[PDB]
Design an enzyme around this catalytic site. Sequence first.
Site, PDB file in Angstrom:
ATOM      1  N   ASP A  25      22.160  -9.204  -8.290  1.00 61.73           N
ATOM      2  CA  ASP A  25      22.327  -9.963  -7.055  1.00 61.73           C
ATOM      3  C   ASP A  25      22.269 -10.272  -5.318  1.00 61.73           C
ATOM      4  O   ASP A  25      23.405 -10.007  -4.915  1.00 61.73           O
ATOM      5  CB  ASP A  25      22.473 -11.319  -7.570  1.00 61.73           C
ATOM      6  CG  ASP A  25      22.180 -13.137  -6.908  1.00 61.73           C
ATOM      7  OD1 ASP A  25      21.642 -12.681  -5.954  1.00 61.73           O
ATOM      8  OD2 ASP A  25      22.422 -13.516  -6.706  1.00 61.73           O
ATOM      9  N   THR A  26      21.219  -9.441  -4.711  1.00 63.25           N
ATOM     10  CA  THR A  26      21.588  -9.561  -3.069  1.00 63.25           C
ATOM     11  C   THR A  26      21.529 -10.252  -2.142  1.00 63.25           C
ATOM     12  O   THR A  26      22.663 -10.149  -1.133  1.00 63.25           O
ATOM     13  CB  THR A  26      20.027  -8.251  -2.111  1.00 63.25           C
ATOM     14  OG1 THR A  26      19.184  -9.023  -2.491  1.00 63.25           O
ATOM     15  CG2 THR A  26      20.400  -6.846  -3.169  1.00 63.25           C
ATOM     16  N   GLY A  27      21.141 -11.567  -2.630  1.00 67.21           N
ATOM     17  CA  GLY A  27      21.819 -12.637  -1.873  1.00 67.21           C
ATOM     18  C   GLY A  27      22.791 -13.333  -2.256  1.00 67.21           C
ATOM     19  O   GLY A  27      23.988 -14.988  -1.879  1.00 67.21           O
TER      20      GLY A  27
HETATM   21  C1  LIG Z   1      22.261 -18.194  -8.575  1.00 64.75           C
HETATM   22  C2  LIG Z   1      21.252 -17.498  -8.891  1.00 64.75           C
HETATM   23  C3  LIG Z   1      20.687 -17.193 -10.287  1.00 64.75           C
HETATM   24  C4  LIG Z   1      20.280 -17.721  -7.968  1.00 64.75           C
HETATM   25  N1  LIG Z   1      20.366 -17.993  -6.590  1.00 64.75           N
HETATM   26  C5  LIG Z   1      19.767 -16.790  -5.347  1.00 64.75           C
HETATM   27  C6  LIG Z   1      21.434 -16.393  -5.175  1.00 64.75           C
HETATM   28  O1  LIG Z   1      21.040 -14.783  -4.129  1.00 64.75           O
HETATM   29  C7  LIG Z   1      21.924 -17.161  -4.083  1.00 64.75           C
HETATM   30  C8  LIG Z   1      21.434 -17.300  -2.388  1.00 64.75           C
HETATM   31  C9  LIG Z   1      22.308 -18.608  -1.850  1.00 64.75           C
HETATM   32  C10 LIG Z   1      22.923 -17.495  -0.582  1.00 64.75           C
HETATM   33  C11 LIG Z   1      23.958 -18.193   0.061  1.00 64.75           C
HETATM   34  C12 LIG Z   1      23.985 -20.416  -0.088  1.00 64.75           C
HETATM   35  C13 LIG Z   1      23.796 -20.283  -1.346  1.00 64.75           C
HETATM   36  C14 LIG Z   1      21.759 -19.662  -2.642  1.00 64.75           C
HETATM   37  N2  LIG Z   1      24.080 -16.439  -4.054  1.00 64.75           N
HETATM   38  C15 LIG Z   1      24.669 -17.764  -4.751  1.00 64.75           C
HETATM   39  O2  LIG Z   1      24.226 -18.350  -5.348  1.00 64.75           O
HETATM   40  O3  LIG Z   1      26.108 -17.029  -4.432  1.00 64.75           O
HETATM   41  C16 LIG Z   1      26.683 -17.946  -4.551  1.00 64.75           C
HETATM   42  C17 LIG Z   1      27.779 -16.224  -5.032  1.00 64.75           C
HETATM   43  O4  LIG Z   1      27.994 -15.593  -3.710  1.00 64.75           O
HETATM   44  C18 LIG Z   1      28.398 -16.415  -2.810  1.00 64.75           C
HETATM   45  O5  LIG Z   1      27.543 -16.424  -1.372  1.00 64.75           O
HETATM   46  C19 LIG Z   1      26.100 -16.872  -1.080  1.00 64.75           C
HETATM   47  C20 LIG Z   1      26.690 -17.875  -1.457  1.00 64.75           C
HETATM   48  C21 LIG Z   1      27.877 -17.834  -3.017  1.00 64.75           C
HETATM   49  S1  LIG Z   1      19.643 -19.552  -5.682  1.00 64.75           S
HETATM   50  O6  LIG Z   1      19.807 -19.607  -3.558  1.00 64.75           O
HETATM   51  O7  LIG Z   1      20.678 -20.274  -6.529  1.00 64.75           O
HETATM   52  C22 LIG Z   1      18.058 -20.067  -6.397  1.00 64.75           C
HETATM   53  C23 LIG Z   1      18.189 -20.895  -7.891  1.00 64.75           C
HETATM   54  C24 LIG Z   1      16.552 -20.470  -7.970  1.00 64.75           C
HETATM   55  C25 LIG Z   1      15.534 -20.533  -7.652  1.00 64.75           C
HETATM   56  N3  LIG Z   1      14.134 -20.678  -7.716  1.00 64.75           N
HETATM   57  C26 LIG Z   1      15.401 -19.753  -6.311  1.00 64.75           C
HETATM   58  C27 LIG Z   1      17.140 -19.411  -5.659  1.00 64.75           C
END
Ligand SMILES: CC(C)CN(C[C@@H](O)[C@H](Cc1ccccc1)NC(=O)O[C@H]1CO[C@H]2OCC[C@H]21)S(=O)(=O)c1ccc(N)cc1
EC number: 3.4.23.16
Lengths: 99, 99
Positions: A25-27
């Site tokens: 998960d690069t996000g």
């Molecule tokens: C949790 C994943 C399975 C899904 N997510 C993508 C994810 O990359 C998010 C993307 C993301 C990024 C920033 C803020 C919210 C969401 N990152 C995330 O939740 O990371 C958390 C852990 O490390 C922290 O750094 C970022 C937030 C924390 S998501 O943003 O919830 C998402 C969920 C459903 C859909 N359809 C599209 C995207």
Amino acid sequence: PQITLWKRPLVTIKIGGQLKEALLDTGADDTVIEEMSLPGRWKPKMIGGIGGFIKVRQYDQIIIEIAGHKAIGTVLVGPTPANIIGRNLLTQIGATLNF
Amino acid sequence: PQITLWKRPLVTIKIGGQLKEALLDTGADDTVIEEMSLPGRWKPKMIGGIGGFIKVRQYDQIIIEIAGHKAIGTVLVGPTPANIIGRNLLTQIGATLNF
Ligand SMILES: CC(C)CN(C[C@@H](O)[C@H](Cc1ccccc1)NC(=O)O[C@H]1CO[C@H]2OCC[C@H]21)S(=O)(=O)c1ccc(N)cc1
Ligand SMILES: [Cl-]
């Protein structure tokens, strides 16, 4: 390997000696794993995602194998919708995005 | 290009005539953009992640340029804390994860 993105980038991990499935998960800044028993000391933390904040157990310096590659770092354990491997560990295994 | 993951993998995008910064996110099935007034028809959707669900507007066949690469597909718009380029458009610009 080189992983294309037509499917979810799911891999097998080993954590606490147990095999699990996780999403690369690069996000995600951080690695978040579903509730499990894990050896090590932990600290209470909160982490936020798309929908708000959850409470997690922060375990530092945990050995985790990711698709056959070793990392040792912080794992947050709590009620996540998915086991996610975030950048704190993706950097350890040398992962990059390419296009 | 190659993007290492020491920092968030943010790139410039163009959508609805506006430039924004967005994450290249292998963990996201779909692309989610911060609230903006896009024209045309849409369908309600709910998407879930850490912290729970948010309500978004699903727009189809939206043109979106990602780091200079053209793409066209579904875009979800709503109260996300981050602009997220998900796999539905990462595949169109030929992105891979490599380790
Ligand atoms: C949790 C994943 C399975 C899904 N997510 C993508 C994810 O990359 C998010 C993307 C993301 C990024 C920033 C803020 C919210 C969401 N990152 C995330 O939740 O990371 C958390 C852990 O490390 C922290 O750094 C970022 C937030 C924390 S998501 O943003 O919830 C998402 C969920 C459903 C859909 N359809 C599209 C995207
Ligand atoms: Cl699509």
